[PDB]
């Protein structure tokens, strides 16, 4: 089991609940997300922090499981997370792609758009449904960032968070960047935090 070093520490919790990521989707709920937690009035939902963090360290374990970080690919067609993908591409291999995800990235064995991944991550399955659908044609497991009403089908690991909030998507991308570095051995300072802060992964209008 875990050595109890991945518990809900205050330092990773203060920034987690200061970015309104605890809120979920509207009254519409999917049974793939049983994380409902005393739903708040006005129709908005509230997710429980413990399961999100526990599955987030599990998701980071998936990325650290691969021997070659190059095959790790992150898919993001939404404009908020485009800068997050290219920024995550520097700390590790993390072969990035932003903007319009080209169709047939894994297939079409002659095109210059060749991709040979093992793990691919999608920030929002509703917009990047093509990548997840294609990932089921080349036998590649997928990780997804799913809210309480997102189309979470075709998903192995779902990270419950808010994909509509600007801070939340960049926040979760930052945490998984830390943990994958921590389990890879690059971040020896397990107790000490990471120098770069979360709003690094923030797209801006200019």
């Amino acid at each position: 089991s875990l050595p109890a070093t991945f518990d809900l520490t205050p330092e990773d919790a203060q920034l987690l609940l200061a970015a309104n990521t605890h809120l979920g989707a509207r009254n519409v709920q999917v049974h793939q997300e049983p994380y409902v937690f005393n739903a708040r009035p006005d129709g908005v939902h509230v997710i429980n922090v413990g399961k999100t963090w526990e599955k987030l360290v599990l998701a980071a374990r998936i990325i650290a499981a691969i021997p070659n970080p190059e095959d790790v690919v992150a898919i993001s067609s939404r404009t908020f997370g485009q800068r997050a993908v290219l920024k995550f591409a520097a700390h590790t291999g993390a072969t990035p792609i932003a903007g319009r995800f080209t169709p047939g990235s894994f297939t079409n064995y002659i095109t210059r758009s060749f991709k040979e991944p093992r793990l691919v991550i999608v920030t929002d399955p509703r917009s990047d449904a093509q990548a997840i659908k294609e990932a089921s044609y080349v036998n590649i497991p997928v990780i997804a960032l799913t809210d309480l009403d997102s189309p979470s089908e075709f998903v192995d690991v779902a990270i419950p968070c808010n994909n509509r909030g600007k801070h939340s998507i960049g926040l979760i991308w930052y945490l998984l960047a830390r943990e994958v570095l921590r389990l890879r051995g690059a971040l020896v300072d397990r107790t000490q935090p990471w120098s770069i802060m979360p709003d690094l992964y923030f797209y801006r209008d200019p």
């Binding site: 200061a18 922090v49 802060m197």
Partner: protein
Amino acid sequence: GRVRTKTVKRASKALIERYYPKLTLDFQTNKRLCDEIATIQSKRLRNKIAGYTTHLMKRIQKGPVRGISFKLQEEERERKDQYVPEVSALDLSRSNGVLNVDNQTSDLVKSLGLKLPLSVI
């Protein structure tokens, strides 16, 4: 039909991504410089490639656009020069009086009990 074709367009952005800081807004020296780049057969086409190349160079002066890479689109200088916009974002701001007054949150999440006010509505 005064419309450009991909024949002059494929050669143009190829010139920009590799031979940008050679040319200028000038026209006739752009024609002369085209001789000093990869050989092109027809002089009639040279009249159009020089005319096109300055056309993008008027557009870039009022804001660079997609499809061009002359090492300043690849500026990559601290992302968008904001790199780490810390300015004590995870403290200060509202943390001086402590932020996140909230409602029905970690105050009722029994995993752990953290600080900050928990009474708003």
